Amino acid sequence: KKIDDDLFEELEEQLLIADVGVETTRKIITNLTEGADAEALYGLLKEEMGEILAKVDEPLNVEGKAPFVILMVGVNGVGKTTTIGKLARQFEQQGKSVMLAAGDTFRAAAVEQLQVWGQRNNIPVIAQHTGADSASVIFDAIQAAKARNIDVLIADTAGRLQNKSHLMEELKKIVRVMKKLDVEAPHEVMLTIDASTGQNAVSQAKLFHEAVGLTGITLTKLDGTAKGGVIFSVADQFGIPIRYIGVGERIEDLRPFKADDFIEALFA
Ligand SMILES: Nc1nc2c(ncn2[C@@H]2O[C@H](COP(=O)(O)OP(=O)(O)O)[C@@H](O)[C@H]2O)c(=O)[nH]1
Ligand SMILES: [K+]
């Protein structure tokens, strides 16, 4: 097969369906045309996509803090609660002690889901009454983690993103409250975004990144039909490391991010 305008239009369609986005797709194609049979083109495209993801493939390292604090941010419905448990199991398998903070204080089901999971798995969960102050719950969790020599503290947060909610200011307050106990905390600000939301994750990454500064991303629900192409836009615009991929609903379904596999899956 030979290179022509039909192949570049074919590639654009495939990238748009993968949620790479209009802007990122346009940039990628123009770079592909300038950089440049069909098979060679797909080889070159995968290579240039590899160069994008290479800049954000740093794996998360949680060792050496007391505790290492992960602030979990994201909007509701993306898999934040599930991911926290998957992370907790991951770190415990590595021999680290874990504590959870139920900072999404107005969602009773989310709080109780964490409490019950933690109880079943012998992981302490710091929680207060429904509607309690998120910053206070997370304050108590850090104190308890320090008192109890916990290696990793994972702090959940609210995820209602509307002008009523003042979520960004709440997160900023949480961070300031954190730094009164440990100036290095939070050691990781982990955004969870849902592959099935497509390009809406770009807006979310922008909001959370501008408010508290993201240092890592978990992309969930890659096991659906969604391709997760938004990460190219986030990488190009923000350069935030992709730490993990969610590949299911089971507690094991959290995988370290791998650039090569992700690229192949995008075209499968
Ligand atoms: N297929 C799939 N479902 C996921 C994944 N991560 C989370 N979920 C699903 O999304 C729902 C829960 O998301 P949840 O953690 O409650 O969302 P939150 O509101 O962001 O805390 C559940 O039905 C989970 O099964 C994933 O990686 N793959
Ligand atoms: K997929």
Going by alpha carbons, the residue nearest to atom 1 of ligand 1 is 248
Partners of 220 in the β-ladder: 194
Which tokens is 64 given?
């050496």
Q: What is the resolution of the experimental data for this entry, in Å?
A: 2.1
Ligand 1 touching residue 107 (CB < 6 A): no
User: Is position 198 annotated in a ligand binding site?
Assistant: no
Partners of 255 in the β-ladder: 245
User: Which strands form 254-256's sheet, in the order they lie side by side?
Assistant: 125-126, 98-101, 152-155, 68-73, 188-194, 216-220, 242-246, 254-256
User: Is position 159 annotated in a ligand binding site?
Assistant: yes
240 CB contacts (<8 Å, ≥6 apart)?
A: 56, 191, 205, 209, 214, 215, 216, 217, 234
Q: How far is the CA of 31 from the centre of ligand 2 (A)?
A: 25
Distance (Å, whole) CA 211 – CA 168: 6
Q: How far is the CA of 253 from the centre of ligand 2 (A)?
A: 14
User: Is position 43 annotated in a ligand binding site?
Assistant: no
DSSP conformational letter for 224: S
Q: How far is the CA of 147 from the centre of ligand 1 (A)?
A: 32
Domain 5-55 CATH (choose: 3.40.50.300, 2.60.120.650, 1.10.10.10, 1.20.120.140):
1.20.120.140
User: Is position 81 annotated in a ligand binding site?
Assistant: yes
Task: Confirm or reject CATH 3.20.20.450 for domain 68-267, answering yes or no.
Answer: no
Q: How far is the CA of 197 from the centre of ligand 1 (A)?
A: 12
Mutate to test the pocket of ligand 1, among 104, 249, 250 (most ligand atoms within 8 A of CB): 249
Pairing of strands 125-126, 98-101: parallel
Distance (Å, whole) CA 100 – CA 114: 8
Instruction: Find out whether 219 and 195 touch, Cβ atoms under 8 Å.
Output: yes
Mapped onto helix, strand or coil, the DSSP state of residue 134 is: helix
Give the technique used to solve this structure.
X-ray
Instruction: Find out whether 74 and 201 touch, Cβ atoms under 8 Å.
Output: no
Helix 200-212 with 230-238: angle, nearest 10 deg? 30
Q: DSSP for 43-77?
A: HHHHHHHHHHHHTT-PPP---S-TTEEEEEE--TT
| Domain extent listing, the chain | 5-55, 68-267
For residue 95, what are the CA distances in angstroms to 92, 228, 251? Answer: 5, 31, 17
Ligand 1 touching residue 103 (CB < 6 A): no
25 CB contacts (<8 Å, ≥6 apart)?
A: 12, 15, 16
Mapped onto helix, strand or coil, the DSSP state of residue 247 is: coil
Find, among 199, 246, 196, 227, the residue nearest to 18 by Cα.
227
User: Is position 2 annotated in a ligand binding site?
Assistant: no
Find, among 67, 61, 84, the residue nearest to 215 by Cα.
61
CB neighbourhood size of 120 (10 A):
9
Going by alpha carbons, the residue nearest to atom 25 of ligand 1 is 249
Pairing of strands 242-246, 254-256: antiparallel
